[PDB]
Amino acid sequence: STIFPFIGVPEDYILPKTEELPIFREVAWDFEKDEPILEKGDFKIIEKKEALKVWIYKCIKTNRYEHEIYSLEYGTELSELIGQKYTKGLTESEASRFIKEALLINPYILEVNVKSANFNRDILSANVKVSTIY
Template sequence: MSLFPIIQPQAAPEIDVSLPMYRETAWDYQKNEPIWENGAPVIVEGKAAVLVWAWNALHTPRYRYEIYSWDFGNEVDNLTGQSFSDDLKRSEAARFTRECLLINPYITDIKDLAISFAGDVLTISGTIVTVYGEVELNV
């Protein structure tokens, strides 16, 4: 009898990790409101839907609204009123943006992220790499 018997573990069953097609309500980015047609919301799929999700996540402060999970939204509001240098503010805004977007399993990377402040207006642009391809982000 051995103190350490040989155990033959069974292989874990393979899990289907494919994601279903992502669908979201189409968004009018100029008016910042959903698009309706004949009394019903217009639905978009794929990378256009992921872009709508990203737009809304970046426009929603994290932890402020009970309707959203604590994973949804951004924390850029934490920079308001802080006496940080401009470089530190841009760096933190980039970090908050990445944390906000990469929580979505349909988003695999963010490229060419550019952050700028003009007074009290924050502008974010870059390329979101999704499972469906790349899409340009301008918020």
């Protein structure tokens, strides 16, 4: 509480720690049945990339302003595109922006890219690449 590190730190002084995030861990989830997974009569815990997959799935699957429990940041506005309310190019731009802005609130996710986009009948397809710290 004595040092003044704003101009420079003293040579003898040791920095307490380097700031890093803990290992991301989450209750495992199965996607074809939409349930948590029980292992030996208890919830099964996964870590790192699989936990991030679970979180991403949950974030994409929710609507933005629908629920009172969530804040204004959590969710996705992809439900406003159903029915071709906008033109096709505007729909592509909006979808890309929506997905990027929704995913980038997690501190463990570094960059999101929506590369491909195709229109076939009433289906819109896209490829999303997520880069994490791991």
